[PDB]
Structure formats: C-alpha cells, structure tokens
A paper describes a structure:
RNA polymerases (RNAPs) are the engines of transcription and an important target for the regulation of gene expression relevant for health and disease. We have applied single particle cryo-electron microscopy (cryo-EM) to characterise the structural bases of RNAP inhibition in archaea. Here, we present the high-resolution structures of the inhibitors RIP and TFS4 in complex with the 13-subunit RNAP from Sulfolobus acidocaldarius. Our results reveal intricate interaction networks between inhibitors and RNAP that rationalise their modes of action.
Like RIP, TFS4 binds tightly to RNAP and efficiently represses transcription. In order to investigate the structural basis for TFS4 inhibition and compare it to RIP’s, we solved the cryo-EM structure of the RNAP–TFS4 complex at 2.6 Å resolution. As proven by the cryo-EM map, the TFS4 ZRN interacts with RNAP between the upper jaw and the lobe. The N-terminal segment of the TFS4 linker forms two β-addition motifs (β3 and β4) by providing one antiparallel and one parallel strand to two β-sheets in the upper jaw of RNAP. The TFS4 ZRC binds in the NTPs-entry funnel of RNAP in a manner that is related to its eukaryotic homologues, but without reaching through the pore into the active site. Rather, TFS4 allosterically inhibits the RNA polymerase by inducing conformational changes driven by the displacement of the upper jaw, encompassing Rpo1″, Rpo5, 6, and 13, and the Rpo1′ clamp head. The superposition between the apo-bound and the TFS4-bound RNAP reveals a swinging movement of the jaw in unison with the clamp head by 6.3° concomitant with the splaying of the DNA-binding channel by 5 Å. The ensemble of bridge helix and trigger loop plays a key role in the substrate nucleotide binding in the active site and its translocation cycle, i.e., the molecular mechanism underlying transcription elongation. In summary, the changes induced by TFS4 binding include the (i) widening of the DNA-binding channel, (ii) melting of the bridge helix, and (iii) displacement of the trigger loop. The TFS4 binding in the RNAP funnel is ensured by electrostatic interactions between the positively charged TFS4 ZRC domain and negatively charged patches on the rim helices, and the upper jaw of the RNAP as shown in the interface analysis of TFS4-RNAP complex.
Numbering used by the authors:
A (entry chain E): 1 to 182
B (entry chain B): 1030 to 1120
C (entry chain Q): 36 to 78
D (entry chain F): 1 to 109
E (entry chain K): 1 to 86
F (entry chain A): 823 to 880
G (entry chain A): 2 to 528
H (entry chain B): 785 to 816, 829 to 882
The structure:
Amino acid sequence: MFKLVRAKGIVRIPPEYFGQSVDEIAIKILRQEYQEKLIKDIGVVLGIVNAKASEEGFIIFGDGATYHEVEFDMLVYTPIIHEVIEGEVSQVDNYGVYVNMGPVDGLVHISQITDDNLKFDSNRGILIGEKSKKSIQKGDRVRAMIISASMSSGRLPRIALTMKQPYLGKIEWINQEIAKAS
Amino acid sequence: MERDCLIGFGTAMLIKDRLLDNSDKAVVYICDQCGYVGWYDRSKNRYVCPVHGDKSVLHPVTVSYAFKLLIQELMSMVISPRLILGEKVNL
Amino acid sequence: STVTISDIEMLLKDTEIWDKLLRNELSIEEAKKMFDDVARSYS
Amino acid sequence: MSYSLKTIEEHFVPYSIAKKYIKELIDTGSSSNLIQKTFDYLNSISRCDEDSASKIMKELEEIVKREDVRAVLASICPTTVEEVRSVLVIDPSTIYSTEQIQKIIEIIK
Amino acid sequence: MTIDKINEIFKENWKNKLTKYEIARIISARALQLSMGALPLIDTSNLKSDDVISIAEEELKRGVLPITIRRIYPNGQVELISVRKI
Amino acid sequence: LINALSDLRIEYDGTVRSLYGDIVQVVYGDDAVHPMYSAHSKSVNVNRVIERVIGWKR
Amino acid sequence: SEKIIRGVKFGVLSPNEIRQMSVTAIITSEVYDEDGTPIEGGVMDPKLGVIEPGQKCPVCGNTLAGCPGHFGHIELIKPVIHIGYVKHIYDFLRSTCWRCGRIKIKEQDLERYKRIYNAIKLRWPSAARRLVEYIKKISIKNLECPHCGEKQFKIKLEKPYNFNEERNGSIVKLSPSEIRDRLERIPDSDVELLGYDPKSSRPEWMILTVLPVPPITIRPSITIESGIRAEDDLTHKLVDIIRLNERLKESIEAGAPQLIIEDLWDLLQYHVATYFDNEIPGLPPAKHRSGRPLRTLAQRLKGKEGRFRGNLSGKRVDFSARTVISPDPNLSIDEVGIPYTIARMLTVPERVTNINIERIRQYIINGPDKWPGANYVIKPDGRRIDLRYVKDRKELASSITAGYVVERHLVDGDVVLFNRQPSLHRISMMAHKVRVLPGRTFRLNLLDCPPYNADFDGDEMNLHVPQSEEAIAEARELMLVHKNIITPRYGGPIIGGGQDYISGAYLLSVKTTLLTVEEVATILGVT
Amino acid sequence: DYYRLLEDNGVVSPEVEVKGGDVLIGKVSPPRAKRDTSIVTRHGENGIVDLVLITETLEGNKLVKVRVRDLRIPEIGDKFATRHGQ
Amino acid sequence: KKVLEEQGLDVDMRHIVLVSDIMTRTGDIRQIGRHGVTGEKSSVLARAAFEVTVKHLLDAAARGEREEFKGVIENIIIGQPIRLGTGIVELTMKPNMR
Ligand SMILES: [Mg+2]
Ligand SMILES: [Zn+2]
Ligand SMILES: [Zn+2]
Ligand SMILES: [Zn+2]
C-alpha cells in the first residue's frame, strides 16, 4: 500500500553550499541521501516532495558544516500483508508468474493460480489449464493477494502472491464468476 | 605534565591533535545490542558482529587504538566491557 | 533500629521530602511539619 | 552527514492521489527510471481521479474507522457486494451497511 | 542580590562581552569552514596575509559573521549573543 | 593535586562547580578576580589609580 | 552512521558469551609442526587473527589493517578459581547458607533492607555502601540459617586461593566444584542486596569453566635479526594450561588414583591463576628460558611502562623535534629560531583555496630539497604524491585546483609549541612564531628564559607542530607568548630584563650620560 | 644501490664516502633460504672509510673491522670549558 | 600559607582557599590522594589510571559498575573533546547570510 509519512531529522549543509537558500540545499541533500534507499521500519522510499528547514544550524567540533532540523514529507510504499491489489503480468516462466507491483515485481508460483492441474511453458509460452481452459500472457490485468512479505535490502521483490481465494483472478475471470454465482 | 599544561590553557582541539590524530587514531565497529567490536567483511559487503552474525547493525567509532587494545586485554581476563553509543548531533 | 540504619533512613526521608517540595507537590508549611516530625522521631 | 529520521505521521494513500503526488514529484524532481516506471504502472490500473478518490475516502470514515482499508477501497472499486468480504481482512464483522458502501461507489466513480 | 552581589556583578559584566574561549572557538570554526570552500565575507584583495586564520580574524574584528553564541546557565536559563554587527 | 582538582570549572553563574555538578565555591575566590589579572593579589590598587589620574602635579 | 562513546558497562563474562563469541576451540597443544605451518586448533591458529602484511584472514576478508583479532576458548573439565575475584567469592561464601542459598537474615528485616537499598542506591552511593557493609557484617556472624537452623560452619581463606571449612573434623578443604555449586543457589534478589548486579555479574561466573584465548593481534611474534622468532609470554603460558588440560583429562578416563588427580588439579589452577597475574604473593614466579620472570596480563597494565601510563595517559607523537638551545637577542619574544633542516622535514598541511593558490603553486615548484617548498601533494580523492619522484613539478603545479592539500615546509610566521621539561606550570609550553635561520640549534630570546627556567649550559627543548586548522587557531589565540607575560601564580610579570639589560639601563639612564646626534642615531638604529 | 660500495670480497674500500644506511660489510647467514645479515652505517651519520682490517680469531673465523671518520668543525651549539669551572 | 610564605615563595591566597575548600567538602577532612578526594571520583578509568593497579577494574566488573565519561581524563584516554575552555562554548550559524 502506498503511504505518505512526515519526518523530522538533522541535515548537514556542507560549507561549499553556503550563501544560498537553506531549503533548496536541504531538499537536494535529502534527495541525494534518501532516494531509492530502503528503511527498515518505514519501507522503500520513492522520493521527497517538500522539505522545510530552520535557518539556524549548530556547529560541532572537527566539522565546518552546519546541522539543521528539517521537516519533510515522504512517498514511501510498503506492501501490507493481507491486502487485495491489482497488477499486471511482467514475465512468465517455469519459475512462475511475475506480477509487477509498482516499483517492484510480485511473485506467484505455479501451484497457486487455480485449484486444478495446469501446464506451464507450453506452446507460444502460454499457461493452459487442462480442465479450466485458462490462458494468461503479457499485458494482463490480474488482481493479486498478498500472503507474505519481508524486507532486508538483499532483494526487494521477495513478495509471495496468492490466487486460490475465489472472487480473485483476472478481471474477466472474476466477472464471469460473479455472473454465474447468482 | 604536558597534557596538564594543555588542559590548563583550555585547548580541546589542540589536545585532540596532539594525543589522538598524530599517535594512534583508529576506527572500530560496535554492535548496538552488546557493545562488542565487530568487523567489515570486505567481500560480502556486510557488517559482522561476533555474537550477532548479521542480525544487528554496527556503527563506526573513531577511537584511540590503545583503548581498543585495552578493551581486548580486558576481555582476555573474565571482564565484559560493553561500549554504549550515542549521537554526535541531537534534535 | 540501629544508629546507622536510623541515620540512613532519616537521610532518605529528608531526600524524599526535599524532592516532593521541589516539585511543588507540597507547601512550605507541610514540608516544615514533615521535617520536624522526622527530626523528632529519629532523635 | 548525520541524520535521525524520526516519523510523526502515518497517513495512507490510495492509487489515484499517489498518481497525483508522483506526477507532482516527477515534473520538478526529474527522478530516475524507477520513479518514472512506477508512474507508468499507475497510468493504467488507476480508475478514478484525485477528487473521486478523495470523496470516496472521506465519506467512508463513518462506515469504517480504519484508514488503511479506505485506501484500498479507493483504488480497486469492487462495486460488488460479493467481493467486499474478500477485501476485508479484519476479524470483527462489519455492520450490514455494506450495501451503502457500494452505493457511494457509483455516485463518485 | 539574587544569590550575592558579586554574582550579579559577574553576570552583568559578561552580559555583552566575549570570553577568550568564545573568540578562539569562533575563529577556529570560521577558519575550518573557510578552508573547506566557503566564500569570505570581506574583500580579501588587499589583506596582508591570505591564510584562512588571518581572514577569519579580520572577519571577526569587523562584525560580518552570522554566528550566535548560546550560553546555558546552570539553572537552565539561556542567553544568546550575536557577533553579526553586535 | 592534579588528579584531585582536574574537574573544577568556572560557570557563567560565577560559581565553581565540578563536572559532575557538585558546588565547591558559591563565587570563585571572594570577588571572582583572576590572580593573573590581579594587581599583585589586589583586584584594584586605588593608590595606583590616584597616581594615574593626578600624578603629574603631585 | 558515525557515533560516539557515551558510556561503558562492566560485568563478568558469562561462559555462554565466551562460547558464543568464539570462532574455534583450542584442543591441540602443538604450536608448530616440522615444516612450520600452524596447526589448526592450536594457539597460533590463523582463524584468530593476522599479523603478516601479506596474509589475509579467513574469518574476515581483511588484511592486517582491517582485521580485528578473533577470540578462541579453552574448555576446562575441572573448574578453577579466578584469582581476581577471591575477595568477592569469600564474601559470598561467608554470608550465605550452604543449603538454600540465603543471606542468613530474617526475611522480615530483609524485605525492609531491600526496600531501603533500592530507594537510596543512586542518590547516596556512600550510604548504600555503608548499608551493604552493615548487612554483610550482621549476616556473617549468624552461625544458623533462619530458614534452616542447620548450624552453619565458619569458612577461612588461606592465601592465595585456598578455602578451608571448619566442621566437626576441624579440617576439610573445598574444591572449586562445590564452591561453584553453592554459589549457583543464591537468588537474584539476595545478590542485588549484597551490592552486585545479578543480570551482568552472576557470582558463579567467577568460577571458571571456559577460558578465552586472546587474539594473535595482541599476541605478536617479534621478528629478530638473529633468525629465531621469539614468542610473547601469553602463548608460553597458554601452552602450559592446554598441556595440563590434556595431562589431567587422560587420567580421569584411564584410572582414578584420586591423589594424582588432585595433585594435577592444584597445578592447572596454579597455571591459570599465574596466567591471569604474575607476582602473586606467596607464589613462585614463572620463567621460560633464562630464569627471567614472565610478563602476564596484569603486568601489561601496571607500571610506568604499562598500558595505562605508557600508552593511554602519555604517548609518543609525530611532528616533533628536540635540539640544544642557544640565545638570540634579535628575535621577538613571540619568535623561535629553527634550523633549515628541521623546517624542510616537518610540514604543515594546507588545503588549497582560491586565495592562496599561487603561493601554494610556488611551493610546489620548489621540490622537497629547496626551502620554502613542499614534500607531498594530496589529491581531492585522497592519493598522496611524493614530490621527489615527480618527473615534472612545473606541470603538477599548474594542474592543482581548490580542494588539493599540499604538505609544505615551515615558513616564517608559523605557529609551533615550544616546551622545556620538567613541565611544572602551563607556561612551560607556549606558542611561538617560526623564524628559519642558519644553524643547527633552537634559538630563543633572552627575555623568554625565566618562564622556561632555561639556560645556555647545554640545555635542550622540544618542538611540536600542530597539524589541523582548529589546533593552530587555538594555539595562536590562547597560547601565544606575549599574552602570558603575567603569571597566574601571583599578579606579576614572569618576563623581563636580565643581566646586561639591567646594567645597560643603569648606564644609559644615569644623569651624567650625554649623547651626540650620531650616537643617538646609532642607538636608535637597532629599534 | 645499498651494495654499490662493496668490493668483490664483500667489504668496502678505504677513502670512500658513506651515508647513513650504506652497507660496509656484506654477510649472508645459514637458514634458521639464506638470510641477509649485513652491517650498515647508522642512521644520519656520514663519513669516510678510514681503515679496513682482516684477520682471524682463535677458532679460525674471519674477523673484519671497519673504521669510519667524520670531520667536526666548531659551530653554534658546541660546548667549551676552562680549567676554572666556566 | 605560612609554610609557603616562610620560604619566600609568593602564591596567591585564592589557590590555597580553593584547596582548603576541596579537602573539606564532605564535612570531614579528606586527603587529596587515594583514600580521599581522588578515590571518591566517579570514574573507573580515571581511578585505574591514577592508581595503575588493575584491582579497580576487577571490582567494577564484579559489581557491574557503569562509567559515564564526565571527567576530562577519561575523555582524553578514549579520545574525545573535553568540556573545559573552548569545550564549554557552543555555536550556531545562519549560512544564508552572505
Ligand atoms: Mg642548563
Ligand atoms: Zn552484537
Ligand atoms: Zn580477521
Ligand atoms: Zn538455609
């Protein structure tokens, strides 16, 4: 789920950037130091939209730079467990189906698309179900389910997807399911 | 006695320059949970703490090398000196 | 109790009274009364 | 370069106004491809406008008192009563005003 | 007489006066950040010496430095002194 | 002596305190006058001031 | 993120911690085989650390620069007493019951004692110490546990580490196993009331079951030109402990005379106690080859050449010089005369800005052998350049910009610290301005001698060159000579006239002295 | 370049200027490969080779002695005394 | 004062008064050495440096003491700036004012 958090911190203004507006330098330093950088308790950062810094900065021993208190708004995104999110198929192989989830790509394995027997990597690279008559390929719009996810900065797209739950799947699959349910 | 002279004059940065920068300045990595000295692996690009693996975060601290030698010599005896860390700048 | 234990306890009580007075949880008169009570009880 | 990075707010953002914010970020920040790629991901799945997502998210405060579920109801628009329970992952049972939730969907979206 | 008259005289004397430690700290900080690429706030075209410490001394003598000393008294009271044109 | 006295400091109050907060003297010395700035242990030599002012005609 | 040290927490090292931090286990007592490679599992296992410039550590992919030492552990089958904690084990033994492990005080008074101690432990540490001493004094002399009433027996300590009960037989000696088993029974509350931290210093941890093995980084091998490596005494002891550990283990599983077992248990314990500390009172010192007593862990820390007073309170420093001194009446009181040789060896690192670029370029054009010149150039990314190995110094001068660092010679007007020992007051070391002169001596003005108590009978003084901008600024602002004319001991000048000055002043100022225009011009020409 | 002064028998020749670090006698020792155990001029002590002596000890081992001389001219900083304690 | 003065040595009285104050602070007369003012200091490392013995560190480990780096000697030992002289001053700047 996409989030927007507000944060307060200390930003260091190098002496070579003196004589100009503190806000511009502060937002520049924040972008150079927080863009595309994973945070353990907040998630992966997608950028800084606005920042406000105080004009007073304190000086410490051994440094020529000034340190200012800054308040800024972030655009962090973190996929929350047990949430229904739409997505698109990015690549399909014997590994499974890779669904794109914004900056990262989700992962689902062949054992959990439909409660049946299916053959993957068939002719024309299409996953076809023997008793379901289902075809999935590029450009699809799937509505996936989150079951488990963890972040360690070793590999961002380590997200596991789920499709066994009814009322979930392709937009056409769910539409026919609803129509035939009643 | 020269250190006492420098203290009497009130020169903190001169004391630092004489007694740390020009003799045995060093950098060590401390686990934030146990306060023991870790290391940088330089091959897997990760911080490793001896009781801790990669389950904790290590921070670099500039210190006199003789103080680290003293810490290791104290751990040679059955003594557990744990270093407590702090921030240079606070809110 | 023992003289040393009585001294330690009266020091502790004086410390508590001063702490409570300095936090504006007591008035000057109440602090005076408690100080007198402790001094008389531990004399 | 010493930082603290303490957080104060924990607001939630649906897909539609996330498009608004990244657009307000890409135009002046001129970020990398990863930020630009995320915008492409939102160029198709997004179904409503910023005002539509705001209206649906603000009118559901009384029906449900959780901000996280309101941000996913403002991005998917289930518009059916048979799949809302699939979206719900909250143990307490919601009152039988779910039919009102769907009604709010089409008047806005 | 808050505590004693001598203490009041002391605090009144040091109200608008810089101690030698504050002058040394200001000059050292200014020189350190001036050697790191900062732009001098004075002309620096006809000065006798062109090293950073001399320029910092001249910048302190004629108040152009936007630096503020924060004095914290033991009871918690805070006094602010500005060296920018006093 | 150095190890006994090394932690004493002059405060902005005018008080002599230890770095642990203990008060040693309410005001340094008795008049808060540094011996280095003294007129040989005297804060002011009044006879010297008189000589400074009217010494050319005395 | 860069942090700072704001505290140190002390405690006793738990055996679980000793095992957990260890990278290996020392079992073999053989240090080196025929060829010379170190045996895996010995004292010189490469897993412990690297001391060779070209070797790489197995535990961490780091060389001698980036590798901190790693710890091993020696497993002990029979527990031993740590000699540094005997006075604490003795107090734990004398003030606790040996059946239930209690302070031997009625719990009604014990609860209020604990309440008071918890209330006062932080505000009045001395009162807490007195309270703990009182509790120990009244609990030692009980002779019957209130929870048991089992006729507690008094315990006596025989130096160095011999504990002796006094039962009905009047003689029985306690083994470390029973001592540790008794100390395991004490609860955390009773330990806390006695003045010890239970979660960080548990009393039975003072009885050793596992022994840490120091890293080789603190245990280096001295390279002597004689061709034979000399090992430090720590390895020379650790081999003895591991030998006795192997020597005693085989006896347990093969036979049980029970008299040779205790005659080896009293030798391993001696070895461990002497490894921790030599010069134990009432105990023979240990030699290695020539009857010279060994230097052990506690000997590396005490003395005037030990760790503390030799490396922590004071140390040898860089950018310093020492030379005989000679007079110079032509210097200012702020100046010191420096030889050309010393000016060209000691350097000051100056960062290049847009105001000083031409002067630094002229320094670079001159090499390391012409004054004023430079010895090194540091590029902005951080690579040094030896200017004596540069093919063309004129092109390197043209290529420097703001951000470069040039280590240039001393020039006239530089600030240095000038010192004479012993340093009795603070003006025994003052800041001076450099002046480079021909000669091989430190030149000093004659009016500057009283503060240094200096003389020209063959005396020598020290020089120190501050290296950073902040240090130089502090030295120039606070330590300059003329700012310290009046001494802090009393309100009087410590700098003034000497011997020829006084008689010259008398002869000039006497009322019979008459001068002509030429003589006046000659006198005033020196001013 | 530290062995440029040795002759074919491993020892320097008289009337040769030497600097600190120059090798005067070349020597290799049995392993305890062969190790270099040469003797060099001490640090910062120039001079001229004055005498080279080759003989044998009682056992029969070769013994080599080299004398180096340095000229000293009085300069500022040298000590002098009279027969009266001055 | 009498001992110093009868030898012809000039020392200002403020130093002597400060010494007298430091030796009577606790309500009793204490020596400046090990069993007095110096031994009452709340730093383990400073005490172990003045008294080069190691028994102080063993006592601290046994009792689980905590060392907090408030004095000047311990900070010099570990290598951090002291709070005397220029260490009492704290600065603030406005970089924008050019
Ligand atoms: Mg002499
Ligand atoms: Zn750890
Ligand atoms: Zn290693
Ligand atoms: Zn009992």
